[PDB]
């Protein structure tokens, strides 16, 4: 009932449309680490 969802799911989809969802995952969580494997 809160008319907010398409406003926000816009920003949900767009971050991976940009791939900046991946950028922000890699920010505080790089996949490399001290153990590469």
């Amino acid at each position: 009932g809160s008319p907010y969802r398409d406003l926000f799911s816009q920003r949900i989809l767009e971050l991976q449309d940009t791939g900046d969802l991946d950028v922000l995952k890699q920010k505080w969580w790089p996949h490399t680490g001290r153990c590469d494997l």
Binding site: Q10, L13, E14, D17
Partner: protein, 50 residues
């Protein structure tokens, strides 16, 4: 239909081409049918767009 108890119909886009986003910032196809709202849904293969 079977899990809810409600009705449906089966129609068609004359393009069948996911629509085409225009430089009119508009559409034919499955999207232009709902710009005009001649339809209600489109249940098939789907491409995802913001």
């Amino acid at each position: 239909a079977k899990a809810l108890g409600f009705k449906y119909e089966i129609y068609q886009a004359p393009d069948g081409r996911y629509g085409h986003q225009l430089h009119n910032t508009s559409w034919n196809g499955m999207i232009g049918e709902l710009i005009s709202k001649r339809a209600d849904l489109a249940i098939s293969a789907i491409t995802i767009t913001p």
